[PDB]
Design a protein around this ligand. Structure first.
Ligand SMILES: Cc1nc(-c2cnccn2)sc1C(=O)c1cnc(N[C@H]2O[C@H](CO)[C@@H](O)[C@H](O)[C@@H]2O)s1
Ligand code: NI
Length: 158
């Protein structure tokens, strides 16, 4: 079991960390959503499904810099939403195949009314999300730590 970003950053078997750079809508209005759909950028696969079945949770998610201070919101993980920053490990997702399969985590962030100026600086860390992979076969428990960075800039217009 390993994972890769869209543009080819790779976290190997056993876990590790990676940076993932994402494009954001340039304007979000107070009352509207800024979506971060990592399921278009983070992909995983079972490396021997013949015998093994891999289980994947979002162990933990945390907000940094801009999103940490001008935004509230949730994280949708497999059809269901949860508070973000996270308060609890999410349910398991089953990684079936040797075929690359999206990590289906997306953030929905709304700006607080005091969000004025540039809410998120470009090139800043906005989120860290810890992918935790166990299985049905041995005692393996590995964290795949993704550091989410912003490409462009987002402003919230007064
Ligand atoms: C499980 C297994 N049986 C093999 C076999 C069976 N019969 C005759 C010859 N050989 S080879 C064989 C194997 O190749 C393995 C392939 N990956 C293995 N472990 C890694 O991948 C698993 C599946 O994604 C993860 O759940 C685990 O955490 C770790 O990352 S063991
Ligand atoms: Ni592989």
């Amino acid at each position: 079991f390993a994972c890769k970003t869209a543009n080819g950053t790779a976290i190997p078997i056993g876990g590790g960390s990676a940076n993932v750079y994402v494009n954001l809508a340039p304007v979000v209005n107070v009352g509207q959503n800024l979506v971060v759909d990592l399921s278009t950028q983070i992909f995983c696969h079972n490396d021997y499904p013949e015998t093994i079945t891999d289980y994947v949770t979002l162990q933990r998610g945390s907000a940094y810099g801009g999103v940490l201070s001008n935004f509230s919101g949730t994280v949708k993980y497999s059809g269901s939403s949860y508070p973000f920053p996270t308060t609890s490990e999410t349910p398991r997702v089953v990684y079936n195949s040797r075929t690359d399969k999206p990590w289906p985590v997306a953030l929905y962030l709304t700006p607080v009314s005091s969000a004025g100026g540039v809410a998120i600086k470009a090139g800043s860390l906005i989120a860290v999300l810890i992918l935790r992979q166990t299985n049905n076969y041995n005692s393996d428990d590995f964290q795949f730590v993704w550091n989410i960075y912003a490409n462009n800039d987002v402003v919230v217009p007064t």
